[PDB]
């Protein structure tokens, strides 16, 4: 029985605490190794319907591989004579029991796909991905047409890729926390927005520099210059997010905010959110400055007025996200809607007018 | 404890079998009602992580609502004096335990999204839906262009609609059996293929009729109406079967040790719509072969002919694979996506290339 195998495991760890000889550790470790392997070959009833080679069933067994591996490390020091170092390894076994195996042994709550809020979020993302791919295809098909050629094409592609990845974020956020889902959400949430606003601050800054009324040919105006500038700004976020993923490796952890419920969530720190959020905020603030400066520019069917109201909305979304995310226990769904709403604003305000002039009024397109 | 509540439930049902008085039934029913309500308020360990208002948790409690409701029906007949009719209600309670609750109490096997075969199937369907929506958009954008206008646009929309729906089928088939998923797969598997082969049998019949004063039923409306009547035969056939054989998730016992959660779809529920689709494919192939060397519309008829020979082989292979092996869900999944993929691939890839790669 797996319920009694976990009892032998816990009671033998207590023997290490009150150990006053080498024989009281070696016996309690060998007995613990056999009790851990007996629990590994078992299946918890919440995984009884799952395939023996399902990701959860693989992760369940892997938790015991770490644990049995740690028992081998403790028996190495004990058989050597260094029983003092083997005694300290007992506390390392307790932390393993919580971070890899406990989630499979106690009732753990987490955000399901079944929840109305996550059904709305994923339904909205499917529409988002569909409309984004629709927009992208029209942009690609009407490549050489004067409506799309006149704007920064390569930069609009980065914006669309950022918007697309923005709609992918809820799938990684609503998915039951796994090392992979925790990795991807940190990467995708940080970079999706950074891609949009890195290309947008490049686009709007270029528009602000264009605002000038013999002369000299202006630099960093080229399509390649724009892509390079945007790429350096995105790479700042990529460096920031990846460095944090390295020093704070993504993991599913058990949170205890409620007195009765145990919640399975990602181990993402405040720093893991504030550092990339602050950089996205820096881009959104830079964007809005240039968007406002050029709000009344009538060039490209009042393209600038649409960027301006995209930016005022994004500012409000960002400003609302900080107290909602840091002041409430709705962190997953808040992130979901902050990303999906901010990217919908951009897709809607910035691309719907262009689509209209292309797929509904092609006489004004020429 | 829910494990001991199910013990009281089973042992009191045994008392009804060996009952030789009205007192031995009334006591065993009241004791069973209290034991059922005690099990309903509980949570099985495979649902311990689930929200109390999750679909599984709701369906778990609903199984006891039927069961407690049945105990009320049996106590109605027992208190009346008709203990003979109340005794028969004990066998009706055993089925309720099986068809609605047992799946949450015993380890049950079913096809999960985690399986490599269903990962491939869903990955292939996502590409399918994407390519289908890509094709549809090009068809819609290049509406008035001579390549798409010369054809039956409205019928191609039916073909693509059926093809799209063909790729939607694996999502309903791989999803853990629920009443909804069982309804949707019967509807979608039957109608997806019927949409494709009704619009195609109409298209190819026309091509074959052209092979020869003004000919009738040649119009864009006539084609859509003819296709719609043929689809409605499948819709009538599938819905009538859904009515006389309501879709439900049930526990199958093909393996001596493994219990499977599957949809209660009968051989008839598969053979009747499969046979009609087979009739449509056979009719299609007849006309496709008859007009295999027609050079009109960039050898349009050649692509249909090959599409039809492949679809015949897929259908002919589906019957012994589906009826002769325990790979019924994944077989349906690939029979539908593969047959739809030949149509999308063979018939629409050249149409794209002659629009988006070779604009004359
Ligand atoms: C283009 C837009 C409008 C389509 C959106 C995609 C739709 C079809 C998807 C996205 C989210 C989906 C839901 C995801 C979660 C659940 C919970 C599950 O237990 C039952 C099905 C249900 C309720 C899904 C049904 C289909 C759904 C509504
Ligand atoms: C045309 C486009 C919009 C349709 C494609 C929808 C994509 C986003 C869907 C289709 C099938 C989906 C997967 C189906 C199975 C699972 C199992 C669950 O444990 C985690 C989510 C995961 C991994 C899903 C995530 C989203 C998914 C990849
Ligand atoms: C019309 C098309 C393009 C819509 C997009 C694809 C649909 C079918 C996808 C998108 C997201 C998907 C869902 C995402 C994740 C899960 C969780 C898993 O535990 C059960 C299936 C379920 C609920 C998926 C079923 C299929 C799904 C609803
Ligand atoms: C072209 C479009 C339709 C493809 C987009 C597919 C997206 C939605 C895919 C690509 C990789 C995917 C993820 C791969 C890994 C995991 C970890 C797993 O434990 C839960 C699901 C999750 C988080 C997946 C969900 C869906 C996902 C984010
Ligand atoms: C590129 C085109 C063909 C679209 C492909 C969509 C891809 C990205 C989707 C479709 C189905 C998906 C898978 C559905 C189920 C699972 C099981 C889950 O526990 C881990 C992720 C994994 C393995 C998903 C990864 C992403 C996936 C492979
Ligand atoms: C908008 C139109 C044209 C496309 C149809 C949308 C499709 C993709 C949606 C709508 C309703 C959906 C289903 C609703 C119910 C269930 C039952 C559940 O056990 C898992 C998912 C499953 C099987 C869904 C899968 C996706 C689904 C079939
Ligand atoms: C644990 C999970 C649930 N939470 C997260 C969140 C983040 C994260 C990183 S950056 C960001 N930004 C900028 C916005 O959400 C944002 C962007 C633009 C706006 F207009 C409004 C808001 N969010 N990273 C990791 N984990
Ligand atoms: C129990 C579950 C798993 N199986 C099903 C199957 C059906 C069903 C209805 S019609 C059909 N056809 C025609 C094909 O599958 C078909 C179509 C074209 C081909 F080339 C080959 C085969 N299948 N309906 C409900 N449930
Ligand atoms: C902008 C970067 C934000 C960095 C500030 C992070 C503040 C925080 O919450 O982290 C704890 C802090 O690093 C103390 O050890
Ligand atoms: C119209 C032709 C119908 C073709 C469908 C033939 C199905 C064969 C069949 O009825 O299957 C028997 C199986 O052994 C039962 O389990
Ligand atoms: C044609 C459609 C079938 C494609 C479906 C994909 C895999 C099906 C594999 C089933 C093999 C039958 C097993 C027979 C046997 O075990 O002897």
Curated annotation (Swiss-Prot), chain A:
Effect on the protein upon substituting residue 216 to W: In a colorectal cancer sample; somatic mutation
Subcellular location: Cell membrane; Postsynaptic cell membrane; Cell projection, Dendrite
Residues on Cytoplasmic side: 141-154, 206-223, 293-305
Extracellular side of membrane: 176-183, 248-270, 328-335
Disulfide cross-links: 182-266
Annotated transmembrane regions: 118-140, 155-175, 184-205, 224-247, 271-292, 306-327, 336-360
Tissue expression pattern: Detected in brain.
Protein role: G-protein coupled receptor for glutamate. Ligand binding causes a conformation change that triggers signaling via guanine nucleotide-binding proteins (G proteins) and modulates the activity of down-stream effectors. Signaling activates a phosphatidylinositol-calcium second messenger system. May participate in the central action of glutamate in the CNS, such as long-term potentiation in the hippocampus and long-term depression in the cerebellum. May function in the light response in the retina.
Family of this protein: Belongs to the G-protein coupled receptor 3 family.
Subunit structure: Homodimer; disulfide-linked. The PPXXF motif binds HOMER1, HOMER2 and HOMER3. Interacts with TAMALIN. Interacts with RYR1, RYR2, ITPR1, SHANK1 and SHANK3. Interacts with SIAH1.
Involvement in disorder: Spinocerebellar ataxia, autosomal recessive, 13: A form of spinocerebellar ataxia, a clinically and genetically heterogeneous group of cerebellar disorders. Patients show progressive incoordination of gait and often poor coordination of hands, speech and eye movements, due to degeneration of the cerebellum with variable involvement of the brainstem and spinal cord. SCAR13 is characterized by delayed psychomotor development beginning in infancy. Affected individuals show mild to profound intellectual disability with poor or absent speech as well as gait and stance ataxia and hyperreflexia.
Protein's recorded name: Metabotropic glutamate receptor 1
Organism, as annotated: Homo sapiens (Human)
Full protein stretch here: 581 to 846 of 1194
UniProtKB/Swiss-Prot annotation, chain B:
Transmembrane segments: 118-140, 155-175, 184-205, 221-244, 268-289, 303-324, 333-357
Disulfide partners: 182-263
Residue ranges that the Swiss-Prot or TrEMBL entry lists as coiled coil: none
Ranges of the Extracellular topological domain: 176-183, 245-267, 325-332
Tissue specificity of this protein: Detected in brain.
Function: G-protein coupled receptor for glutamate. Ligand binding causes a conformation change that triggers signaling via guanine nucleotide-binding proteins (G proteins) and modulates the activity of down-stream effectors. Signaling activates a phosphatidylinositol-calcium second messenger system. May participate in the central action of glutamate in the CNS, such as long-term potentiation in the hippocampus and long-term depression in the cerebellum. May function in the light response in the retina.
Disorder noted: Spinocerebellar ataxia, autosomal recessive, 13: A form of spinocerebellar ataxia, a clinically and genetically heterogeneous group of cerebellar disorders. Patients show progressive incoordination of gait and often poor coordination of hands, speech and eye movements, due to degeneration of the cerebellum with variable involvement of the brainstem and spinal cord. SCAR13 is characterized by delayed psychomotor development beginning in infancy. Affected individuals show mild to profound intellectual disability with poor or absent speech as well as gait and stance ataxia and hyperreflexia.
Subcellular location: Cell membrane; Postsynaptic cell membrane; Cell projection, Dendrite
Membrane-side (Cytoplasmic) residue stretches: 141-154, 206-220, 290-302
Membership in a protein family: Belongs to the G-protein coupled receptor 3 family.
The name this protein goes by in its record: Metabotropic glutamate receptor 1
Quaternary state and interactors: Homodimer; disulfide-linked. The PPXXF motif binds HOMER1, HOMER2 and HOMER3. Interacts with TAMALIN. Interacts with RYR1, RYR2, ITPR1, SHANK1 and SHANK3. Interacts with SIAH1.
């Amino acid at each position: 029985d797996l319920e009694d195998n976990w009892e032998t495991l816990n009671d033998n760890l207590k023997v290490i605490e009150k150990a006053d000889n080498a024989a009281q550790v070696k016996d309690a470790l060998t007995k613990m190794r056999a009790a851990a392997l007996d629990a590994q070959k078992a299946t918890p009833p919440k995984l009884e319907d799952k395939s023996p080679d399902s990701p959860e069933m693989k992760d369940f067994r892997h938790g015991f591989d770490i644990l049995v591996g740690q028992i081998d490390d403790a028996l190495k020091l004990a058989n050597e004579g260094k029983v003092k170092e083997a005694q300290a390894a007992a506390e390392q076994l307790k932390t393993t029991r919580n971070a890899y195996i406990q989630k499979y042994l106690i009732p753990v709550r987490y955000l399901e796909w079944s929840n109305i809020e996550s059904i709305i979020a994923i339904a909205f993302s499917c529409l988002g991905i569909l409309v984004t791919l629709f927009v992208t295809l029209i942009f690609v098909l009407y490549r050489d047409t004067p409506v799309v050629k006149s704007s920064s094409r390569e930069l609009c592609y980065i914006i669309l890729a950022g918007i697309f990845l923005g709609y992918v974020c809820p799938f990684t956020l609503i998915a039951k926390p796994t090392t992979t889902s925790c990795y991807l959400q940190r990467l995708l949430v940080g970079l999706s927005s950074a891609m949009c606003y890195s290309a947008l601050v490049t686009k709007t800054n270029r528009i602000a520099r264009i605002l000038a009324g013999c002369t000299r040919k202006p630099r960093f105006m080229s399509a390649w210059a724009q892509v390079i500038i945007a790429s350096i700004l995105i790479s700042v976020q990529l460096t920031l997010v990846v460095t944090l993923i390295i020093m704070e490796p993504p993991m599913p952890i058990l949170s205890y905010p409620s007195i009765k419920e145990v919640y399975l969530i990602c181990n993402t720190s405040n720093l893991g959110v504030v550092a990339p959020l602050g950089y996205n905020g820096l881009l959104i603030m830079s964007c809005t400055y240039y968007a406002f400066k050029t709000r009344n520019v009538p060039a490209n069917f009042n393209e600038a007025k649409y960027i301006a109201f995209t930016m005022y909305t994004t500012c409000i979304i960002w400003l609302a996200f900080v107290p909602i995310y840091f002041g409430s226990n709705y962190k997953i769904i808040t992130t979901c809607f902050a990303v999906s709403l901010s990217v919908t604003v951009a897709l809607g305000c910035m691309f719907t007018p262009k689509m209209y002039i292309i797929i509904a009024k092609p006489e004004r397109n020429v």
